[PDB]
Amino acid sequence: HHHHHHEMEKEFEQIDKSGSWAAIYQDIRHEASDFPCRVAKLPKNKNRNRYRDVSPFDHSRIKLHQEDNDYINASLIKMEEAQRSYILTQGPLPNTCGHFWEMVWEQKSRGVVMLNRVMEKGSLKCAQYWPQKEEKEMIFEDTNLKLTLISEDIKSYYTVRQLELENLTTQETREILHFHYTTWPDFGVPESPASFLNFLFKVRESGSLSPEHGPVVVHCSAGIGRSGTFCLADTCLLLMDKRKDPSSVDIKKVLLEMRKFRMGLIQTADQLRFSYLAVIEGAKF
Ligand SMILES: CC(=O)N[C@@H](Cc1ccccc1)C(=O)N[C@@H](Cc1ccc(C(F)(F)P(=O)(O)O)cc1)C(N)=O
Numbered sequence: 001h002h003h004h005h006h007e008m009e010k011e012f013e014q015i016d017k018s019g020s021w022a023a024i025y026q027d028i029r030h031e032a033s034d035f036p037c038r039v040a041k042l043p044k045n046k047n048r049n050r051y052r053d054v055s056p057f058d059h060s061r062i063k064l065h066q067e068d069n070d071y072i073n074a075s076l077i078k079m080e081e082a083q084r085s086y087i088l089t090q091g092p093l094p095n096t097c098g099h100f101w102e103m104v105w106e107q108k109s110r111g112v113v114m115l116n117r118v119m120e121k122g123s124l125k126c127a128q129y130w131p132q133k134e135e136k137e138m139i140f141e142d143t144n145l146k147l148t149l150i151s152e153d154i155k156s157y158y159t160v161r162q163l164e165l166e167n168l169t170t171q172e173t174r175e176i177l178h179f180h181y182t183t184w185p186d187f188g189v190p191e192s193p194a195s196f197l198n199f200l201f202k203v204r205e206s207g208s209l210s211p212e213h214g215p216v217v218v219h220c221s222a223g224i225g226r227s228g229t230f231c232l233a234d235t236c237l238l239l240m241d242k243r244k245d246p247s248s249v250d251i252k253k254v255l256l257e258m259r260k261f262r263m264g265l266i267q268t269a270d271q272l273r274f275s276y277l278a279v280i281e282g283a284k285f
């Protein structure tokens with residue numbers, strides 16, 4: 001009701017006018033939990049990690065069902081109250097695209113939400129693991145998978161793709177919905193709260209976040225800044241819809257909880273502010 005929104009808006013306005021995002025964000029960083037990442041740091045996993053400073057904790061990492069090397073830089077974020085799980089991963093490296101799709105298949109994901117661009121700051125921050133119009137069919141090496149591009153709808157702030165993923169061995173095929181938000185700079189904010197929400201609701205209406213499917217797979221370059229921003233906003237809007245009093249949602253507490261599953265979620269105070277703004281904006285709907 002109007003009082004809940006009124007409180008939400010005033011609160012946001014109070015924090016904004018006083019420019020208090022920096023400190024809130026600082027307490028979150030200073031209080032974030034730290035768990036071991038032994039597997040991530042194993043020598044054999046060196047070229048499976050894009051950055052040495054971004055690793056998945058052991059307890060929540062995603063394990064490939066293979067026997068050779070079940071390691072991938074992806075973490076399982078599980079939010080009980082909100083009743084949603086998300087997989088947050090780094091942008092695939094040229095040598096981990098098979099793994100990426102293996103994980104999608106094994107986790108039974110229906111959707112993949114991409115928040116970065118392939119080239120950022122002059123270098124490859126994400127190998128193109130999906131097919132292009134010219135060569136609509138990709139075959140992934142020793143992961144025994146086949147991916148084909150069914151449709152592509154390029155819009156102003158994002159692109160939506162229908163992909164068909166096939167297990168070459170069993171011949172089972174599955175529909176994968178790819179949601180590429182193409183205008184979110186690394187360490188920056190989205191185009192606007194409205195393009196972001198429009199994007200998020202688009203992912204929601206697709207049925208990719210429902211418990212009928214494995215967890216949505218979300219990534220950016222490192223899988224913590226933008227990926228964390230996207231997931232914190234979704235989860236908070238979820239809690240706002242599930243609780244008797246939506247105004248009781250504790251953004252800092254919710255982000256700290258998510259941070260138990262993967263380090264660095266939300267990389268700048270402006271990304272924390274944007275996330276908050278996306279929630280009270282989305283709460284209207
Ligand atoms: C090869 C390698 O490991 N290089 C390191 C060197 C380094 C620099 C500064 C501090 C610590 C380590 C590196 O670049 N790490 C990056 C990792 C990183 C890159 C981008 C992001 C991100 F938010 F955009 P997103 O998760 O939205 O893709 C978050 C974290 C960094 N910290 O900026």
Ligand SMILES: CCCCCCCCO[C@@H]1O[C@H](CO)[C@@H](O)[C@H](O)[C@H]1O
Pocket residue numbers: 006007008010011014236246247248249250251275276277279280
């Ligand atoms: C991410 C979105 C989080 C929304 C949480 C909003 C919590 C509102 O919090 C309320 O704001 C009022 C207005 O300043 C204050 O007067 C109340 O004391 C305070 O509890």
